[PDB]
Amino acid sequence: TSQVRQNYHQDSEAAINRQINLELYASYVYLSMSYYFDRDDVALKNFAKYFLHQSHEEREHAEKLMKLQNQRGGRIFLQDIKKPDCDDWESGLNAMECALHLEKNVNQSLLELHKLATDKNDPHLCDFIETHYLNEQVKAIKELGDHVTNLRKMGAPESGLAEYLFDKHTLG
Amino acid sequence: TSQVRQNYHQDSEAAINRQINLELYASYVYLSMSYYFDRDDVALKNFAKYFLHQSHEEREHAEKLMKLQNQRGGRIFLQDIKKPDCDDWESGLNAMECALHLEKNVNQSLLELHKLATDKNDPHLCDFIETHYLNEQVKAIKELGDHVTNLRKMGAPESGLAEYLFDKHTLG
Amino acid sequence: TSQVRQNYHQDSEAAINRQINLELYASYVYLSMSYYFDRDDVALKNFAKYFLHQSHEEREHAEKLMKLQNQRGGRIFLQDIKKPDCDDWESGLNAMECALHLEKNVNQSLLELHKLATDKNDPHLCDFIETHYLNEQVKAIKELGDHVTNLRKMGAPESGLAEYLFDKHTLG
Amino acid sequence: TSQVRQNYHQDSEAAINRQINLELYASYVYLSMSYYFDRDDVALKNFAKYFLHQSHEEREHAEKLMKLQNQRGGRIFLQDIKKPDCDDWESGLNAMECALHLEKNVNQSLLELHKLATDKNDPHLCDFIETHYLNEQVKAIKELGDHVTNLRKMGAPESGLAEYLFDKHTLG
Ligand SMILES: [Cl-]
Ligand SMILES: [Cl-]
Ligand SMILES: [Cl-]
Ligand SMILES: [Cl-]
Ligand SMILES: [Cl-]
Ligand SMILES: [Cl-]
Ligand SMILES: [Cl-]
Ligand SMILES: [Cl-]
Ligand SMILES: [Cl-]
Ligand SMILES: [Cl-]
Ligand SMILES: [Cl-]
Ligand SMILES: [Cl-]
Ligand SMILES: [Cl-]
Ligand SMILES: [Cl-]
Ligand SMILES: [Cl-]
Ligand SMILES: [Cl-]
Ligand SMILES: [Cl-]
Ligand SMILES: [Cl-]
Ligand SMILES: [Cl-]
Ligand SMILES: [Cl-]
Ligand SMILES: [Cl-]
Ligand SMILES: [Cl-]
Ligand SMILES: [Cl-]
Ligand SMILES: [Cl-]
Ligand SMILES: [Cl-]
Ligand SMILES: [Cl-]
Ligand SMILES: [Cl-]
Ligand SMILES: [Cl-]
Ligand SMILES: [Cl-]
Ligand SMILES: [Fe+2]
Ligand SMILES: [Fe+2]
Ligand SMILES: [Fe+2]
Ligand SMILES: [Fe+2]
Ligand SMILES: [Fe+2]
Ligand SMILES: [Fe+2]
Ligand SMILES: [Fe+2]
Ligand SMILES: [Fe+2]
Ligand SMILES: [Fe+2]
Ligand SMILES: [Fe+2]
Ligand SMILES: [Fe+2]
Ligand SMILES: [Fe+2]
Ligand SMILES: [Fe+2]
Ligand SMILES: [Fe+2]
Ligand SMILES: [Fe+2]
Ligand SMILES: [Fe+2]
Ligand SMILES: [Mg+2]
Ligand SMILES: [Mg+2]
Ligand SMILES: [Mg+2]
Ligand SMILES: [Mg+2]
Ligand SMILES: [Mg+2]
Ligand SMILES: [Mg+2]
Ligand SMILES: [Mg+2]
Ligand SMILES: [Mg+2]
Ligand SMILES: [Mg+2]
Ligand SMILES: [Mg+2]
Ligand SMILES: [Mg+2]
Ligand SMILES: [Mg+2]
Ligand SMILES: [Mg+2]
Ligand SMILES: [Mg+2]
SS3 for chain B is CCCCCCCCCHHHHHHHHHHHHHHHHHHHHHHHHHHHCCCCCCCCHHHHHHHHHHHHHHHHHHHHHHHHHHHHCCCCCCCCECCCCCCCCCCHHHHHHHHHHHHHHHHHHHHHHHHHHHHCCCHHHHHHHHHHHHHHHHHHHHHHHHHHHHHHHHCCCCCHHHHHHHHHHCCC
Superfamily designation of domain D1-172:
Ferritin, core subunit, four-helix bundle (1.20.1260.10)
CA nearest neighbour of C54 among C31, C83, C87: C31
B141 to each of A126, B46, B99, B101, B102, how far by Cα in Å?
52, 19, 9, 9, 9
- Cβ neighbours of residue C51 closer than 8 Å, sequence gap 6 or more: C30, C31, C33, C34, C37, C95, C99
Per DSSP, the three-state class of D172 is coil
Other beta carbons within 10 angstroms of residue D7's beta carbon come to 12
Tell me the β-bridge partners of C81. B81
Is A169 in Cβ contact with B160 (below 8 Å)?
A: no
Q: Which of D3, D94, D109 is nearest to D44 (CA)?
A: D94
The nearest CA of chain C is from the CA of A145 a distance in Å of 6
Give me the long-range contacts of B166-171 (CB less than 8 A, separation at least 24): B166/B92, B167/B44, B167/B45, B167/B46, B167/B47, B167/B92, B168/A169, B168/B46, B171/B46, B171/B47, B171/B49, B171/B50
In single-letter form, the type of residue at position B111 comes to L
Contact C67, C20 (CB under 8 A): no
Residue C131 belongs to what H/E stretch?
Answer: none
First CA to last CA across chain D, in angstroms?
A: 51
Cα(C97)–Cα(C3) distance, rounded to whole angstroms? 45
Instruction: Measure the N-to-C terminal CA separation of chain B; round to a whole number of Å.
Output: 51
Closest to C65 (Cα-Cα) out of C100, C117, C102: C117
C103 annotated as belonging to a binding site for a ligand = yes
Residue to substitute from D125, D138, D148, interface B, most B β-carbons within 10 A: D138
Alpha-carbon separation of residue B137 from A26, B133, D139, D160 (angstroms):
52, 6, 25, 51
Q: What is the CA radius of gyration of chain D?
A: 18
The method recorded for this entry reads X-ray
With H, G, I as helix, E, B as strand and everything else as coil, classify residue D39: coil
Residue A154 CB neighbour total at 10 angstroms = 24
> From the CA of C159, how many Å to the nearest CA of chain D?
7
Identity of residue A81: I
Which residue in chain B is spatially nearest to A161 when comparing CA positions? B161
Please tell me whether residue D159 adopts helix, strand or coil conformation. Answer: coil
Q: Are the Cβ atoms of D141 and B4 closer than 8 angstroms?
A: yes
Structural contact between residues B30 and B58, judged by C-beta atoms closer than 8 angstroms: yes
Q: What is the CB neighbour count within 10 angstroms for residue D56?
A: 12
Q: Do C80 and B79 touch (CB under 8 A)?
A: no
- Rounded to 10 degrees, the C-alpha dihedral D66/D67/D69/D73 comes to 140
B104 contacts: CB under 8 Å, gap ≥ 6: B141
Q: How many helices (H) and strands (E) does chain D have?
A: 6, 0
What's the burial of D40, exposed, middle or buried (CB within 10 Å: 0-12/13-18/19+)?
exposed
Q: What DSSP line would sit under D71-135, residue for residue?
A: HHT--------PPPS-S---SHHHHHHHHHHHHHHHHHHHHHHHHHHHHTT-HHHHHHHIIIIIH
Q: Which residues surround ligand 28, an ion (CB under 5 A)?
A: B 71; D 139, 142
CB atoms within 5 A of ion ligand 52 belong to: B 135
Which residue in B has a C-alpha nearest to residue A154's C-alpha?
B161
Q: How many helices (H) and strands (E) does chain C have?
A: 6, 0
Query: Rounded CA gap, C65 and C76, in Å?
Result: 9
C-facing residues of D in 131-150 (CB < 8 A) are 142, 145-147, 149-150
Q: Are B49 and C63 in contact (CB under 8 A)?
A: no
Q: How crowded is the C-beta side of B98, counted as CA atoms within 13 Å?
A: 19
CA D19/CA A30 separation, integer angstroms: 79
The C-alpha atoms of residue B137 and residue B140 are separated, in whole angstroms, by 5
> What are the extents of the domains in chain C?
1-172
**Phi-psi map region of B7: left, alpha, beta (phi>0 left; psi -120 to 50 alpha):** left
Name the resolution in angstroms.
Answer: 1.3
Handedness of CA D67, D71, D77, D82 (dihedral sign): negative
D23 is in an annotated binding site: yes
Name every chain B residue with its beta carbon within 8 A of the beta carbon of A153. Answer: 160-161, 163-164
Q: What is the DSSP string of C70-104?
A: HHHT-------BPPPS-S---SHHHHHHHHHHHHH
Q: Do C72 and A138 touch (CB under 8 A)?
A: yes
Partner chains of D (3+ C-beta pairs under 8 Å): B, C
The span from the CA of D55 to the CA of D95, in Å, is: 13
Task: Tell which residue, C41, C54, C56, C142, has the closest CA to residue C89.
Answer: C41
**Cβ within 8 Å, pair B40-A155:** no
| Interface check D81 vs B, CB under 8 A | no
Q: What is the DSSP letter of A84?
A: P
Backbone angles phi, psi at A98, to 5 degrees: -65, -40
- Answer yes or no: do D153 and C163 touch at CB < 8 A: yes
CB C122 within 8 A of CB C58: no
Alpha-carbon gap, residue A166 to A116, rounded angstroms: 41
| Interface test with chain B among C20, C58, C63, by most B beta carbons within 10 Å | C63
Residues of chain B numbered 16-45 and touching chain C (CB < 8 Å): 24, 28, 31-32, 35-36, 38-41
Q: Which residues of A touch B45 (CB under 8 A)?
A: 146
Q: Return left, alpha or beta for C118; rule: phi > 0 is left, psi -120 to 50 is alpha, else beta.
A: alpha
CA-based end-to-end distance of chain C:
51
Collect all residues of chain B within an 8 Å Cβ-Cβ radius of residue A149: 40-43
| Alpha-carbon span A128 to D30, nearest angstrom | 69
